[PDB]
Structures are given as C-alpha cells and as structure tokens.
C-alpha cells in the first residue's frame, strides 16, 4: 500500500526519479503537473478568458482528464484524445501558471489526486506540495533540490534532446525568474515537509538518486 511523495522545483531530475522509483517498486505513477497541464489545454481550447478565474474554473471543471499510471510511458489524455505531446508545448507551458493559480482549479485536482492515491497498491506522486499539502501522511516523502545552473543545464539538454534550440542562457534566465516569482508570488507551499528526505541532486546521476532512494524504502 506504499504512498511515495516526490516534490521539488523543475529540472532537479524529479520526473525521471519518480518514474524510476515507480518502475522499480511496481507502483503506479501520478504526474500531478501533467494534470494541471491537461486542464490548461482544455482551458485554451475553450477560449476561456485567462484573466477570469470563474471562466478558467468552468473550462477546467468540464475537462475529462486522464494521466497514464504506467511509469514506462508518456500518456496524457483529454476526453480520450492523446495530448502527451501538446501538453508539453509552448502554449500550455505559458498558460499553465495562470490556470494553476485559480483556487477552484487546485481544489478539484487536489481532491482527485488524494482519491487516486488510495486507489490500491503502491503509488509515487510527483508535484510541488505533495508531501506538505496533498498527501501529508505519505509513507515516504522526498524533496529534490539542485542549483539553478544544474536545473537549467538539465532543462536545456532536454530541449536539445527534443530538437528544440540550444540556449542555456535563456533557460537559466527563466529558471532564475521563476525562482524569484516562487518566492514573491507563490501559488502554494513550495518547501520540503519537515519529515521529507531532502536530496541535493546537483552532482548525481538520476540512476544514482533512484538507487540511493530504493535502498531506503
Ligand atoms: Cl515542468
């Protein structure tokens, strides 16, 4: 019945680590970020006024959101359609902060996440405040951190690996800017639970992180 929480800022190796843990543990994998991104895609498709929280709420409420629970596959669904690729595109990336900010959007998705966490057997749940807000009684809580530079290196290498432009300076500026806005305009708690393992992954390979964590479970 193990519930595992994996939190931290983007580019720390968080998704690779969560899927790796889930793969190794024979657990379901719940990418909560993807769920916000799918909601965001529904909001964009609806034409909902992004300055109107009630319009955003309505469009996202109406969305039939599915995330694949299999760590070995990239699967995101909106009303049956495979949107895995699109939810990682520029439009969704740009809008997801606005959609995620709306309290009724979070309330809905948090409740779904809590229910999915008890569906049966093992589950690794990835996010920003899984350990502190969504699943405070999770059995294992992990918070991953790394320097801004290493987070940018990773995120830029991922862009390049996706045929996207190689622009480390721009990605670092973005990581820095989002760090700043997390500290002045956060939309949720963002720090490690007091009962979380805190891992600086700056000089470790994702496989080493997964392996060290497996040794502790
Ligand atoms: Cl992200």
H helices within the chain, ranges in order? 14-25, 32-46, 53-61, 90-100, 103-117, 148-161, 168-184, 206-216
Q: How far is the CA of 125 from the centre of ligand 1 (A)?
A: 15
For the chain, the structural domain boundaries read 1-217
Please give the angle made by the CA atoms of 55, 107 and 189, to the nearest 5 degrees: 115
Q: How far is the CA of 15 from the centre of ligand 1 (A)?
A: 9
For the chain, give the longest Cα–Cα distance: 48
Superfamily of domain 1-217: P-loop containing nucleotide triphosphate hydrolases (3.40.50.300)
User: What is the residue-wise DSSP string for 158-211?
Assistant: HHHHTT----HHHHHHHHHHHHHHHHHS-SS--SPPTTSEEEE-TTS-HHHHHH
Residues recorded for the chain? 217
Q: How far is the CA of 10 from the centre of ligand 1 (A)?
A: 5
Question: Parallel, antiparallel, or unpaired for β 81-82 and 123-127?
Answer: unpaired
The method of structure determination was: X-ray
């Amino acid at each position: 019945s193990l519930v595992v929480a994996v939190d931290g800022p983007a580019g720390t190796g968080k998704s690779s680590v969560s899927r790796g843990l889930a793969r190794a543990l024979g657990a379901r994998y719940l990418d909560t970020g993807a769920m916000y991104r799918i909601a965001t895609l529904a909001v964009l498709r609806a034409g909902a006024d992004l300055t109107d929280p009630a319009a955003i709420e309505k469009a996202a409420a109406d969305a039939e959101i599915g995330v694949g629970s299999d760590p070995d596959v990239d699967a995101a669904f909106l009303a049956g359609e495979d949107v895995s690729s699109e939810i990682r595109g520029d439009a969704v990336t740009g809008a997801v902060s606005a959609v995620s900010a709306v309290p009724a959007v979070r309330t809905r998705l948090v409740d779904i996440q809590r229910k999915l966490a008890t569906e049966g057997g093992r589950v690794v749940v990835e996010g920003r405040d899984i350990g502190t807000v969504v699943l405070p009684d999770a059995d294992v809580k992990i918070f991953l951190t790394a320097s801004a530079e290493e987070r940018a290196r990773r995120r830029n290498a991922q862009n390049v690996a996706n045929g996207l432009p190689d622009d480390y300076a721009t990605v670092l500026a973005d990581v820095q800017r989002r760090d700043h806005l997390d500290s002045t305009r956060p939309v949720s708690p963002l720090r490690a639970a007091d009962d979380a393992l805190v891992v600086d992954t700056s000089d470790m390979d994702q496989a080493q992180v997964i392996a060290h964590l497996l040794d502790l479970v």
